[PDB]
Write a protein that binds this ligand. Structure first.
Ligand SMILES: Nc1ncnc2c1ncn2[C@@H]1O[C@H](COP(=O)(O)OP(=O)(O)NP(=O)(O)O)[C@@H](O)[C@H]1O
Ligand SMILES: Nc1ncnc2c1ncn2[C@@H]1O[C@H](COP(=O)(O)OP(=O)(O)NP(=O)(O)O)[C@@H](O)[C@H]1O
Lengths: 395, 322
């Protein structure tokens, strides 16, 4: 048994999980938020207890110190030397990183190098790596990149139809994200079916606050809906996904919107929130819709249609479909969303069993369906801990 | 019996005897680029100053009286789209206050070729689930179910959807703010990027013309080869969306300068579609026969020459000489 810590550092936050491996049992989890701001709060939960404290937390350096002190001060660990490894979520690995990587000092520089491509995320992700190496010098660390799973896309899937130099010189191409999630659920599906992933054509829908769809054929990602950044693809909580690109120059001429305002339009005011006028939260929009808000109902319907259109593209590209996976906050819990997405797919041999779908059973396809339809809880931290075991503790 | 079809730094004309269909101009039917939301069909002209009110949305084409007449709108066929197909997931007010939504174009072409397909098969068009591919310098796909357009790939303007001669089609919208921030692009520079510099031209760096790109790829140019693959993938991804939406497919139509003539393009688009019952017959595809599916195929695949002028004439004949 090994004790592996999975870390996810944000602009103002620090999420962590401590796992018992290789079984994957959750020892503790928690969140430090509002770092460097007032209302800074530290929440820490075990299997059995919860602790919560509002207190000043200056920077991420102070956030990490409080985490480590609490692990022993709450009796979770007898000592910090019991930690066998740390995995860190990194937003963007560009083309450099095709897999999770052992953290030496010029994987950190490489991650810093890519900062240009994930400005709000990669710098702080690297800061986390730095702090833990400083405060946990003897513990090996692994970086797990949200883009790495998608590096098997072929050129005709990642090249945008712009002038060649926009890729050759500026790096503009599809990257895709949620890589760690799509990887985790597709491998989990294969173990539940008792067949290897290489035998199945799989479409994976990660539907949360951010949403993306991924086509997995022969064990490899061959397409995915997010692109150059996590804004694009299907409709999301506050992100519009794909729209007519010519709308943007129109809006600049018309409303004088800056680049920062265009990006805020696309990332923070669109999606469920922008269409419903109600909320970014699926449950809130659905509640409003059943009370007769027609914009809210339209929002939910458009949400399902955008996902259907993307699934349809990927089934075409693979030449058929053997399994469809739902995951994320919406995909795991909304029988209604899943039903709307899966309706009228007899041309694929795909239909749902209503009773199974209503209780979110693992498999929800109908008795005579040719396509397996799975509801799988995603567990990205578990997937990170397994990357730590694989690359830092190879025995 | 004597119908003229007008399309106006140009002025193209055509006069046909119906119904067999056999200043600068020193019944008639007039091509109009954008009909917005108020024209669901061709319209006897009288309409003219609401046409010009729509110049806001088609400034380069609509404004361009000199000449019974009927206006035919390239957007009109697509006004049967439901809101899930035309509403972008932007803040509501961008549709409700500024009219931003999908309109779609090539409506006359898609309408003409889909009706021609049904006539050749001897069934009502509403009996079929059809995907229509207008592939020329401009490119677009249209899904016709129950005899009505239910989706189409061009959006707010003819710039978007699939990859074309010089137009990019759809791309990650986040690229644009990034290009402004990192290269200071102006709103008009963005437009000519998306409209004039991309597509087959931009990727290949050889030509906007499919044939030119084709020749350069067979001589070993690798950007050219990649441009032709991407071109095909964009169309396939869109066809796949519309098959999903319609719940299946009865027929696939190819038209326009590329679709009517390029066996290569059609073969690459139809590759590995046995899960649909769609496969091509090499011999028929090679000579662009009217039907090119294999004889075991369940999906019909047709090559139909689009005839927008003759479709326009049938519209004035219907609404001006009933
Ligand atoms: N029982 C439920 N029924 C419907 N929607 C739910 C339910 N539980 C949660 N959600 C929605 O799921 C979404 C939350 O997704 P979640 O996967 O938890 O996002 P996240 O953890 O912030 N990161 P990400 O998944 O990448 O967006 C929100 O829209 C919630 O309203
Ligand atoms: N025999 C051919 N083989 C392949 N491509 C062809 C052939 N003949 C014409 N083309 C293509 O036809 C394209 C333009 O087709 P065409 O339908 O005439 O466009 P258009 O007349 O300008 N109007 P539009 O339909 O909007 O594109 C050119 O880019 C050529 O690549």
């Amino acid at each position: 048994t090994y004790k592996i810590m999975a870390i996810n550092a944000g602009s103002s936050s620090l999420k962590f999980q401590l796992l018992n491996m290789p079984q994957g049992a959750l020892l503790c989890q928690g969140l430090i938020e509002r770092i460097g701001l007032p209302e800074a709060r530290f929440t820490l939960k075990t299997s059995a207890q919860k602790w919560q404290e509002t207190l000043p937390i200056a920077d991420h350096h102070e956030a990490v110190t409080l985490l480590l002190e609490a692990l022993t001060g709450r009796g979770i660990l007898s000592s910090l030397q019991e930690i066998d490894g740390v995995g860190h979520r990194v937003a963007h690995g560009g083309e450099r990183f095709k897999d999770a990587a052992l953290v030496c000092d010029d994987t950190l520089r490489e991650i810093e190098r890519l900062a240009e491509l994930a400005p709000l995320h990669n710098p702080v992700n690297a800061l986390g790596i730095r702090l833990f190496r400083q405060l946990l010098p003897a513990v090996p660390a692994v970086a797990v990149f949200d883009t790495a799973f998608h590096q098997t896309l072929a050129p005709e899937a990642w090249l945008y139809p712009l002038p060649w130099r926009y890729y050759a010189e500026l790096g503009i191409r599809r990257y895709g994200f949620h890589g760690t999630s799509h990887h985790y659920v597709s491998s989990a599906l294969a173990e539940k079916l008792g067949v290897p992933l290489s035998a199945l054509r799989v479409v994976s829908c990660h539907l949360g606050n951010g949403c993306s769809v991924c086509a997995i054929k022969g064990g490899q990602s061959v397409n995915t809906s997010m692109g150059f950044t996590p804004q694009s693809g299907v409709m999301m909580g506050t992100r519009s996904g794909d729209i007519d690109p010519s709308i943007l120059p129109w809006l600049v001429e018309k409303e004088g919107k800056s680049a920062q305002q265009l990006s805020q339009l696309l990332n923070n005011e669109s999606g469920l929130l922008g269409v419903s006028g109600v909320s970014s939260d699926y449950r809130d929009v659905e509640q409003a819709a059943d009370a007769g808000n027609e914009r809210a109902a339209l929002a939910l319907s458009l949400f399902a249609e955008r996902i259907r259109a993307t699934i349809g593209s990927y089934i075409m590209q693979m030449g058929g479909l053997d399994a469809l996976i739902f995951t994320g906050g919406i995909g795991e819990n909304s029988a209604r969303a899943r039903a709307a997405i899966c309706r009228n797919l007899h041309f694929l041999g795909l239909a749902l069993d209503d009773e199974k779908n209503q209780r979110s059973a693992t498999f929800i396809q109908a008795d005579n369906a040719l396509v397996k339809v799975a509801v799988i809880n995603t567990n990205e931290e578990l997937m990170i801990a397994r990357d730590v075991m694989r690359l830092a503790l190879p025995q």
